[PDB]
Amino acid sequence: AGYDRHITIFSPEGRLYQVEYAFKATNQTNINSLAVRGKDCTVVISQKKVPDKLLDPTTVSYIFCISRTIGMVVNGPIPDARNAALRAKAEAAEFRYKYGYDMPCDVLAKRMANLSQIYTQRAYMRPLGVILTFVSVDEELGPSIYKTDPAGYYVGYKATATGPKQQEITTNLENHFKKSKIDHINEESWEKVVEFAITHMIDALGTEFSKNDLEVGVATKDKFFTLSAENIEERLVAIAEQD
Amino acid sequence: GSRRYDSRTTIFSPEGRLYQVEYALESISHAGTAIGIMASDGIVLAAERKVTSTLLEQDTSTEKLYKLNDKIAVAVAGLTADAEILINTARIHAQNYLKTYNEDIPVEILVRRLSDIKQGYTQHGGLRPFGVSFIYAGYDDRYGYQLYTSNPSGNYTGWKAISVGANTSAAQTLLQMDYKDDMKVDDAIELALKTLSKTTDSSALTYDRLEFATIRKGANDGEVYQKIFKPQEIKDILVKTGIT
Amino acid sequence: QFNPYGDNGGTILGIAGEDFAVLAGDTRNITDYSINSRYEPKVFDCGDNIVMSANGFAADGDALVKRFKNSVKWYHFDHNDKKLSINSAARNIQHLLYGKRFFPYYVHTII
Amino acid sequence: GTGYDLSNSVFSPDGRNFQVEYAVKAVENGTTSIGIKCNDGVVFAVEKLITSKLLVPQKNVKIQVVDRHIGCVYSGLIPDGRHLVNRGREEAASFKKLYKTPIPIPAFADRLGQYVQAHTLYNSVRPFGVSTIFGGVDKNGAHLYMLEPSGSYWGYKGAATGKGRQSAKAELEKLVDHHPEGLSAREAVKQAAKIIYLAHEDNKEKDFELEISWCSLSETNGLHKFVKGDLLQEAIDFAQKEIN
Amino acid sequence: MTDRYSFSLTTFSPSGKLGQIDYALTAVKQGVTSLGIKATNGVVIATEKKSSSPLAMSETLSKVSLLTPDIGAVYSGMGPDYRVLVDKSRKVAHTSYKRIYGEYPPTKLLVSEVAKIMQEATQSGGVRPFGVSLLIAGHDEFNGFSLYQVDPSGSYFPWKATAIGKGSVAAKTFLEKRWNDELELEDAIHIALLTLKESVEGEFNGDTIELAIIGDENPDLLGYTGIPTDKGPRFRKLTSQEINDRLEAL
Amino acid sequence: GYDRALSIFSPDGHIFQVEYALEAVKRGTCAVGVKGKNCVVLGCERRSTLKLQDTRITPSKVSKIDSHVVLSFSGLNADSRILIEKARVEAQSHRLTLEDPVTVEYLTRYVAGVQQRYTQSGGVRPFGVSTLIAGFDPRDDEPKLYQTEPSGIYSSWSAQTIGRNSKTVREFLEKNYDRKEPPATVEECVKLTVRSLLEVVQTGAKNIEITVVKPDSDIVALSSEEINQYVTQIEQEKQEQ
Amino acid sequence: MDIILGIRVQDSVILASSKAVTRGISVLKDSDDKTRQLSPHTLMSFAGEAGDTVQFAEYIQANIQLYSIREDYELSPQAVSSFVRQELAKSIRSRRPYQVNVLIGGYDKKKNKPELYQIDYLGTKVELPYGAHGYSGFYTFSLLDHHYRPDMTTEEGLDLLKLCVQELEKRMPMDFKGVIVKIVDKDGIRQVDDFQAQ
Amino acid sequence: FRNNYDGDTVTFSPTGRLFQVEYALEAIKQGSVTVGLRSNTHAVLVALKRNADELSSYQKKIIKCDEHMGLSLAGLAPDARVLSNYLRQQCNYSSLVFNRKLAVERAGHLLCDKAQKNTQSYGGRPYGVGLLIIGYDKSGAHLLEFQPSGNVTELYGTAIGARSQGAKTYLERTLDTFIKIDGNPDELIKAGVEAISQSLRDESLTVDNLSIAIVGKDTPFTIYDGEAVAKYI
Amino acid sequence: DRGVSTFSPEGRLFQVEYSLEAIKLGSTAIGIATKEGVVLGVEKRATSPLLESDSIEKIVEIDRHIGCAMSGLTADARSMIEHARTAAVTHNLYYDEDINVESLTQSVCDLALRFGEGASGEERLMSRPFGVALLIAGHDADDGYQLFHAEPSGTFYRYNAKAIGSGSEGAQAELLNEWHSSLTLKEAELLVLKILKQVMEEKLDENNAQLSCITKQDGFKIYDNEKTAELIKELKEKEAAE
């Protein structure tokens, strides 16, 4: 009777506790990340925290390059993150081979969310304690943000945030879009869209960043790429000459 | 491992009973009452619909009375979904016999095979048994008009008049009180309506809460005909019998 | 089309005495009109005082002797180092040969 | 309630896998082992607790080679470490069979990472009771990695796990600070010997044997080789000099 | 590895109750209210698009889905469980019917196929029942217009009008008062917007409400012309503008 | 898929699932078998919890495995059908390969072998059925009577009973059956069968069924009147004293 | 091929099957019974491939006897023939088909009428007043088209078979060593042990 | 504590232990004592066989793997049969495919990996037997101690079973003596008999009780029992 | 619950140890091996007088030179006897010789530990261990007359004399004093018959007790009731002597 909280079966309230505890595992890393849409680009900013001095900082990453076009930032433990990363890369390559065109951002999100649903229904597979955020400039939909969770739920976003301090970043973005009356960041170059994302990250968290505190991923037409420590440094100089 | 969460559906009690079989019979005892009565010139199937509304479409509704063969039909008590899985396999078995021998399947053979499937879930597999009781009304050239019943244990018996579902003890006492061996179908139709009306948990027995089916060999034909009563046809016979 | 079989020639001879037995065989290995080897042992000591030679197709001959020598080895492992008698060896080789009834060892073996 | 720590794949109320955390306790109980990344290679060193004089010296090898360029060393349950190296050897051979080039170190790290992570997804399998320090030289420089029972791995300038991991990490941090330009392969072998001897104080009750291996581009042609003979003794003396 | 859960996770309790089905129905009760009304010349299905965040685009999440060009479906309960059932229902319509008979299955049979999938998730080894109830509305040549409700148990019933979810009890009572067997399609849509308002707490507009109808054939949505027998799909999702125009005549 | 070990040993050296399977036999209706000099008789009692059954079609307790062998049982009615079916298939399989019908011992050995298999296989529960297998060996006039049980143990009896109140009827047979003079006539063999049942049945003319097996495929089941004539004669034996 | 003859008269079915078993050069047996009793009122004769011929017949016999005990009922001659046809129909598309041609003659106790069915190895079933397999039909069909009447008694049918055998002995090259004749009616199956000189 | 985590081998304890493995190790300590020791030329297995009754036989403890390899058992006999038969196959595979005598070190690697697989998967149980493998290959004489945990260690001399500490302490002291017994099989056996007598407590080693096996430079693995071990009592 | 192949804190298998308790409830079986032959004797133990005692088969023939006695759950033995009979005949087919008694016993014991719900090793498809112990007795040219005790544990011991079943502990203690390496075939016949009489709940006669022997000359032979009854009479007269 008390094993309803051990396996993915319904509780007397109609809840699934194992799914709920998988949601709690997503904040284990204590990392905040946001995603915003430009005029023709999509940018993801994530917190980079290297505690041990013995670690090689270049290997510490939660942003993954799934395909040529699609990128993915993860909130949760790295072993489960890399499990979801390898699968997404395998699904992206297979789709192109079978259907003759690069898998869209929303389709990859739906496919990964459908897989997350299986762990929610079947008993032997545990849910992955990670929240996946897919970003790309689709050849049909344009700049796109799609986010999946352990529940098997997915939806599109004008902009999004994930982490322990998610709510503070979310309301900060909401209030900007209520003011601007548009669903995107009206800017031509991606550099300024990255600059926007860093600025509103600082304002929401109330914390200043160095070049090693952040992790940036930029999605453009036909390409997704991650910014190096010097690329972020140039971006931090530009926002400093405004405040 | 996984052993921790195993309910063990196919085990004996210290007394020598089968837990899941016993509890499945408890599940059926709450479902709508279904009655079968055998007459000298046909068989009568009658079933009471469990839970009805004003906005429930009755014309396209079929929850208790199903057609397996051109000669064999069933009454359902218990889970509707679990029944349809067993009904589908029974229809296939009936067609497999017709393909093999070029003859319509005898009633008992179809009943036994369906009961043997229920038996399988009782002995092995680790899965729950089907929470369904059937009343088989059928005709073949060997025994004529036949009435069978089967339960989650996989056991089947023959009857002259039988009831499954809710208030079987009350329904069986009333049937045993008024049944005679030389009954006509019209008398059996009346008995079925009188038995249901007294075992109903609701206020009054109306047409929208009933399903009716008769299997008769029409004297002006020489062949067996199955007649699943329409909403209006149930409404008519309800007035004629003196229930209105 | 690929032919799995071949012929390596040679000849073997086995004569039993009153208290002894000989198994002879030429050391010449050939293919068609060419000589492969002038010294290639064909008769083998398999242990338990038993000698064996399979003559015909060299690859099948070597595989059969290798399988029999190994069959004697496992006979000791399973039966408390019991000596394999000559009549027991002969019956064992029958099952080794008939095992490949539909893809036969192309050899005439003598023990 | 409780019981969240009995099954493997079960999430506890705080989003933790206790069976994984219990496997780390088996690693912490195990022998101390280290890894040092130098300017063109990596150096692996391991403590070997001599239980009695009956143990044959220089025989019970703990450091294992994967392919021809990767070296692996682990702490905790030795048989579990051997199983992981066996899988890694199959995984390295599978890569070379299809792609011709020997498996890159970041590639090999993920291959073990996914395999260990797989043992945290099912209740039918037990997590690995080992933390593996591994690395080598490939197309673009040298790499050093440390893998956890959770499946978590990162790149390391200096890695340490086992009984005296804290004493080792403190000594490794001193090297990173004092050598920003990068330690040499010759210096890394000597220093690894010292760190093991200093980390041995957490297990100073038992006598131990030192075992060192290295993979350097200039010293060993990028191939994994064991430190033997004069260079081994030179390292032992360097450690025995600075222990007092 | 290997699924060692070969035994049933849903079993009969001493009282005769199947716990996991009862709890799955409890999860349906927590879900957002959805409704369906059958008229003389069409069937309407509607639900509230409960936006989890104002930053999230409600358009990219369809609670009402097309199964066949003549059959639509809406739910109440668990979103992910519904989404996979839609994909299974769309495929079973082809594999078990259209690839055999060359035509799309009638409403009653497609509902029966969905019911089978959900029934198996109740009996099969190592699975939990679907935490969703479905409202399936469709049209076929020999049955006309029909509406069905599928439960986690696998049981299904035809309806003239019904609602499931949060305030299903209060919605059904209101539907009983306003329904008659002489309603036009537009009248059914009008009542649908009236009944759904009582369940909606916040904004009630064409952006927060998802509505679709099974009515007349749409040759404009066919995509091709030339074949006389092909006259277009009967299923049509109403746009954000089409809802707002009818909300003014509320 | 499902291979969970249901039938297992307990601290005191018992397999409870096999033990409770015999408790299911104790619940089932009583079945008795006696062998005379040239005939075997199987008698079974009929349940009276519900009385409105169609006796023509309702499955009888005594089932024919072959033309010369019969099988009666006690316990679960659903489990017995599987044992009878497997025995009937094996009966035909033996006639096919050996070119000779089964001996009563061999058919018993098969049924007991199937029951034993279910006591040490994963994912299955043992049969809640004990059987009485009677008949005559091919071209042999020697009567045969065997008994199997859930545990898989089988043995031959001169007289045996199984089911509910089988403890009472066995006592009767232990002090009424003599091995020196087995019932030499079919009539007195049936009489002893009815007498032993009347100790349990408690006045049941329609509750007692009698089947007689004779050598060379001669099996016949007695009608209600034929059995009723024995009951009437037996009730006189008590009253004449 | 072997001789398999069948004729349905007024109240019975008569089957005549050759006695000779020949393997290559020698006649090994001259008293072979090329027929099996499937049920008390149904008989099946067979000819074809050396090994398949008896193996198929006994396999069918086992299944009909199994059904007869399970249901305590005898299948109609139509139902038995439909079972045999399906078995051969599955066989023809298998790895190694049964090369057996059968004649099924039985008396239907319900209809009180004799019935004869002819099925080849392909699974082609047909109901006939008279049937033959192999090369026997090339001589016998024209004979039976001329002399056959439906109201003929069992004795009349035996005389008609005698006329068929005499033609087969005269015109056929193979020595089939005569035939074994069996009658299937309401009383069951009996063998005519005096057909050597009837 | 212990009762919750000893249900199967798949479960770790809060301290990081495997109790089912530890219980399998307890099966060795219940078994009869056996001694292994080697020099630079030979390797000897001296095994004390156990009888159930005085009417029973002293069950065999030494199993031959190949002409150059063999092992002694302590604990469960059928678990020793499975592992020895596996090692018989591996020695045979190396000789048939590679024409190569399997190294004793690699034989220990193979027994380690096979025993490990039973300690990670659900359903399976650990092997309940300790093994002492001796062998002479291309690198001289060898002695290996196998444990159900999977741990295999190369040693000069050792003993496993009941009261095995008495023999192990002796060999730890006699270390510098028996390692130098080269070219003499009899003296190496006598050192093993003196080792196994240190573990004695119940009785004295008799004729049908003592079991001695030897393999070396010019000695194929041969097992001596009864009359052949009378000159060592 | 708990696994069928679970170890106890003492280092034993639960299901194996519980299986030995089931044999302790079974009928008594005694075997004595001499230089003239091996003698086997069992207790029939009929549950009712109506039970035909000759149908009780607890001593079975594996081969002409190998026979065995069973104790405990006798139904579990049927597959073990089948395997033993097959292995003896299959060895005769492969090697044109008689199988060694040790080799036969080893083949039977190879099935004992083949139980589990999915134990990693091969494919052990059996839910529980056998509930029966065997007394395999025979003769071969290499080791002479032999007596083996096969357990559900997979282990087998060779005995000069062994008793298993209900009175196994008291009978074995009796066998300790009575056995010597110079016993004749007849001496062992009365000895089994005497010790059975002690441990049996019923009075020993030729109907509830059965004897059998394996010799090099005649092979495995089961003693008929007439032959056994004469030995009981001889045993009664020798005990009444002193």
Side-chain angles (χ1 to χ4, degrees), chain G residues 39-78:
Chain G
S39 66
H41 302 90
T42 308
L43 189 71
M44 184 184 74
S45 52
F46 50 90
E49 181 66 38
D52 302 343
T53 192
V54 183
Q55 283 281 154
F56 177 78
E58 291 188 11
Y59 167 76
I60 296 299
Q61 189 181 45
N63 280 76
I64 307 301
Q65 285 177 354
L66 180 65
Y67 188 96
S68 298
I69 294 162
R70 192 195 285 105
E71 262 61 56
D72 197 28
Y73 193 78
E74 187 186 13
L75 280 164
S76 62
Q78 198 281 137

XYZ file of all heavy atoms in Angstrom, chain G residues 39-78:
318
model
N -14.058 -42.495 -37.602
C -15.138 -42.628 -36.626
C -16.039 -43.807 -37.024
O -15.941 -44.297 -38.153
C -15.934 -41.320 -36.524
O -16.630 -41.039 -37.724
N -16.916 -44.273 -36.104
C -17.780 -45.437 -36.362
C -18.561 -45.412 -37.686
O -18.909 -46.475 -38.205
C -18.757 -45.431 -35.173
C -18.530 -44.140 -34.454
C -17.107 -43.772 -34.733
N -18.830 -44.220 -38.218
C -19.599 -44.081 -39.459
C -18.897 -43.274 -40.523
O -19.541 -42.782 -41.453
C -20.978 -43.489 -39.169
C -21.802 -44.301 -38.199
N -21.766 -44.095 -36.870
C -22.700 -45.345 -38.412
C -22.596 -44.961 -36.260
N -23.169 -45.725 -37.205
N -17.578 -43.133 -40.404
C -16.778 -42.413 -41.400
C -15.456 -43.134 -41.671
O -14.698 -43.437 -40.745
C -16.516 -40.947 -40.983
O -17.755 -40.312 -40.642
C -15.853 -40.164 -42.113
N -15.194 -43.402 -42.949
C -13.991 -44.109 -43.380
C -13.230 -43.297 -44.425
O -13.839 -42.649 -45.281
C -14.366 -45.485 -43.941
C -13.275 -46.512 -44.262
C -12.643 -47.078 -42.999
C -13.844 -47.633 -45.115
N -11.901 -43.339 -44.350
C -11.046 -42.604 -45.281
C -9.973 -43.493 -45.904
O -9.183 -44.118 -45.195
C -10.399 -41.403 -44.581
C -9.568 -40.512 -45.495
S -8.731 -39.169 -44.628
C -7.412 -40.055 -43.800
N -9.958 -43.538 -47.235
C -8.924 -44.246 -47.990
C -7.905 -43.253 -48.548
O -8.213 -42.072 -48.711
C -9.546 -45.075 -49.114
O -10.414 -44.289 -49.912
N -6.698 -43.736 -48.844
C -5.573 -42.857 -49.179
C -4.538 -43.479 -50.117
O -4.315 -44.692 -50.099
C -4.882 -42.374 -47.894
C -4.547 -43.481 -46.927
C -3.326 -44.143 -47.000
C -5.451 -43.861 -45.942
C -3.013 -45.163 -46.113
C -5.146 -44.881 -45.053
C -3.925 -45.531 -45.137
N -3.912 -42.627 -50.930
C -2.809 -43.015 -51.813
C -1.922 -41.812 -52.131
O -2.401 -40.677 -52.177
C -3.335 -43.635 -53.097
N -0.635 -42.070 -52.352
C 0.317 -41.021 -52.714
C 1.761 -41.358 -52.393
O 2.236 -42.452 -52.709
N 2.454 -40.406 -51.768
C 3.862 -40.553 -51.389
C 4.051 -41.659 -50.349
O 3.254 -41.785 -49.418
C 4.409 -39.215 -50.869
C 5.879 -39.214 -50.460
C 6.835 -39.432 -51.624
O 6.574 -38.907 -52.730
O 7.858 -40.123 -51.425
N 5.117 -42.441 -50.519
C 5.391 -43.633 -49.707
C 5.258 -43.437 -48.193
O 4.546 -44.192 -47.527
C 6.764 -44.197 -50.052
N 5.942 -42.426 -47.659
C 5.943 -42.169 -46.220
C 4.775 -41.328 -45.742
O 4.216 -41.583 -44.671
N 4.410 -40.328 -46.542
C 3.370 -39.360 -46.186
C 1.971 -39.970 -46.095
O 1.131 -39.487 -45.334
C 3.356 -38.196 -47.188
C 4.696 -37.471 -47.278
O 5.541 -37.626 -46.371
O 4.899 -36.735 -48.268
N 1.735 -41.030 -46.867
C 0.399 -41.621 -47.026
C -0.219 -42.177 -45.726
O -1.398 -41.944 -45.449
C 0.364 -42.662 -48.178
O -0.991 -42.998 -48.494
C 1.150 -43.933 -47.834
N 0.580 -42.892 -44.937
C 0.113 -43.488 -43.682
C 0.212 -42.479 -42.536
O -0.651 -42.442 -41.656
C 0.889 -44.782 -43.336
C 0.342 -45.429 -42.070
C 0.825 -45.770 -44.492
N 1.264 -41.660 -42.564
C 1.506 -40.642 -41.540
C 0.391 -39.599 -41.459
O 0.016 -39.176 -40.365
C 2.856 -39.954 -41.773
C 4.067 -40.777 -41.352
C 4.324 -40.761 -39.853
O 4.919 -41.692 -39.310
N 3.884 -39.703 -39.178
N -0.129 -39.194 -42.616
C -1.237 -38.241 -42.683
C -2.543 -38.875 -42.210
O -3.300 -38.258 -41.461
C -1.391 -37.686 -44.105
C -2.552 -36.741 -44.271
C -2.463 -35.424 -43.830
C -3.732 -37.166 -44.871
C -3.531 -34.551 -43.981
C -4.803 -36.299 -45.025
C -4.703 -34.989 -44.578
N -2.791 -40.108 -42.653
C -4.018 -40.838 -42.328
C -4.184 -41.086 -40.831
O -5.283 -40.947 -40.292
C -4.063 -42.151 -43.090
N -3.086 -41.454 -40.172
C -3.083 -41.708 -38.732
C -3.178 -40.415 -37.927
O -3.773 -40.395 -36.847
C -1.838 -42.497 -38.326
C -1.823 -43.935 -38.827
C -0.683 -44.757 -38.252
O -0.014 -44.286 -37.307
O -0.458 -45.882 -38.744
N -2.588 -39.345 -38.460
C -2.666 -38.016 -37.852
C -4.105 -37.499 -37.833
O -4.554 -36.940 -36.831
C -1.740 -37.033 -38.581
C -1.975 -35.574 -38.248
C -1.533 -35.031 -37.040
C -2.633 -34.733 -39.146
C -1.748 -33.696 -36.733
C -2.853 -33.397 -38.848
C -2.408 -32.883 -37.643
O -2.623 -31.556 -37.345
N -4.816 -37.692 -38.944
C -6.228 -37.317 -39.050
C -7.079 -38.180 -38.116
O -7.937 -37.663 -37.398
C -6.743 -37.412 -40.511
C -6.019 -36.405 -41.425
C -8.256 -37.231 -40.583
C -6.194 -34.941 -41.060
N -6.816 -39.487 -38.121
C -7.519 -40.448 -37.268
C -7.434 -40.074 -35.786
O -8.424 -40.173 -35.060
C -6.969 -41.861 -37.492
C -7.768 -42.968 -36.818
C -7.173 -44.348 -37.037
O -5.962 -44.544 -36.922
N -8.028 -45.317 -37.343
N -6.250 -39.640 -35.356
C -6.007 -39.241 -33.968
C -6.810 -38.003 -33.563
O -7.306 -37.927 -32.438
C -4.521 -39.012 -33.735
N -6.933 -37.045 -34.481
C -7.678 -35.808 -34.228
C -9.193 -36.001 -34.148
O -9.859 -35.364 -33.328
C -7.338 -34.743 -35.274
C -6.031 -34.031 -34.980
O -4.949 -34.573 -35.203
N -6.128 -32.803 -34.485
N -9.727 -36.874 -35.001
C -11.163 -37.172 -35.020
C -11.568 -37.975 -33.780
O -12.632 -37.739 -33.202
C -11.588 -37.907 -36.320
C -11.128 -37.140 -37.574
C -13.094 -38.155 -36.353
C -11.656 -35.723 -37.712
N -10.709 -38.910 -33.375
C -10.919 -39.692 -32.154
C -10.813 -38.823 -30.899
O -11.498 -39.075 -29.906
C -9.924 -40.853 -32.072
C -10.234 -42.023 -32.995
C -9.185 -43.123 -32.937
O -8.146 -42.982 -32.288
N -9.454 -44.229 -33.622
N -9.950 -37.807 -30.954
C -9.788 -36.850 -29.859
C -11.024 -35.966 -29.698
O -11.434 -35.662 -28.575
C -8.535 -35.987 -30.072
C -8.173 -34.905 -29.045
C -7.816 -35.499 -27.689
C -7.030 -34.046 -29.566
N -11.609 -35.559 -30.823
C -12.838 -34.766 -30.822
C -14.028 -35.595 -30.339
O -14.887 -35.093 -29.612
C -13.117 -34.198 -32.218
C -14.266 -33.211 -32.264
C -14.035 -31.839 -32.189
C -15.587 -33.651 -32.378
C -15.085 -30.933 -32.229
C -16.641 -32.754 -32.412
C -16.385 -31.398 -32.341
O -17.433 -30.511 -32.379
N -14.063 -36.864 -30.746
C -15.151 -37.779 -30.398
C -15.236 -38.070 -28.899
O -16.317 -38.341 -28.378
C -15.018 -39.090 -31.177
O -15.105 -38.865 -32.573
N -14.093 -38.017 -28.219
C -14.029 -38.254 -26.775
C -14.275 -36.962 -25.988
O -14.933 -36.983 -24.944
C -12.693 -38.926 -26.371
C -12.617 -40.339 -26.963
C -12.540 -38.988 -24.855
C -11.223 -40.929 -27.018
N -13.760 -35.845 -26.502
C -13.916 -34.537 -25.859
C -15.378 -34.084 -25.799
O -15.829 -33.563 -24.778
C -13.065 -33.479 -26.571
C -12.931 -32.166 -25.809
C -12.413 -31.039 -26.690
N -10.981 -31.155 -26.970
C -10.466 -31.554 -28.131
N -11.257 -31.882 -29.146
N -9.150 -31.623 -28.278
N -16.107 -34.290 -26.893
C -17.501 -33.854 -26.999
C -18.522 -34.969 -26.773
O -19.717 -34.694 -26.618
C -17.748 -33.184 -28.356
C -17.693 -31.662 -28.328
C -16.345 -31.114 -27.887
O -15.317 -31.467 -28.507
O -16.318 -30.321 -26.923
N -18.044 -36.215 -26.746
C -18.902 -37.408 -26.691
C -19.924 -37.386 -27.836
O -21.121 -37.611 -27.636
C -19.577 -37.547 -25.316
C -20.120 -38.947 -25.062
O -19.574 -39.923 -25.624
O -21.098 -39.071 -24.295
N -19.423 -37.111 -29.039
C -20.257 -36.889 -30.216
C -19.462 -37.146 -31.492
O -18.270 -36.834 -31.563
C -20.788 -35.451 -30.210
C -21.909 -35.182 -31.189
C -23.217 -35.580 -30.909
C -21.668 -34.509 -32.386
C -24.249 -35.329 -31.799
C -22.695 -34.253 -33.283
C -23.981 -34.665 -32.985
O -25.001 -34.412 -33.873
N -20.128 -37.714 -32.494
C -19.500 -37.993 -33.782
C -19.766 -36.865 -34.776
O -20.914 -36.457 -34.970
C -19.998 -39.329 -34.345
C -19.274 -39.784 -35.606
C -19.879 -41.029 -36.233
O -21.003 -41.425 -35.854
O -19.221 -41.615 -37.118
N -18.697 -36.368 -35.395
C -18.801 -35.337 -36.427
C -19.447 -35.883 -37.695
O -19.279 -37.055 -38.035
C -17.423 -34.760 -36.761
C -16.813 -33.699 -35.843
C -15.323 -33.555 -36.116
C -17.518 -32.356 -35.986
N -20.188 -35.017 -38.384
C -20.820 -35.361 -39.655
C -19.764 -35.543 -40.749
O -18.725 -34.878 -40.716
C -21.821 -34.278 -40.061
O -21.177 -33.028 -40.247
N -20.022 -36.449 -41.717
C -19.100 -36.700 -42.834
C -18.665 -35.433 -43.573
O -17.575 -35.402 -44.147
C -19.920 -37.598 -43.762
C -20.827 -38.336 -42.843
C -21.185 -37.357 -41.760
N -19.514 -34.406 -43.553
C -19.198 -33.108 -44.144
C -18.159 -32.364 -43.303
O -17.211 -31.790 -43.843
C -20.473 -32.265 -44.286
C -20.373 -31.092 -45.256
C -19.659 -29.881 -44.677
O -18.838 -29.257 -45.348
N -19.967 -29.548 -43.427
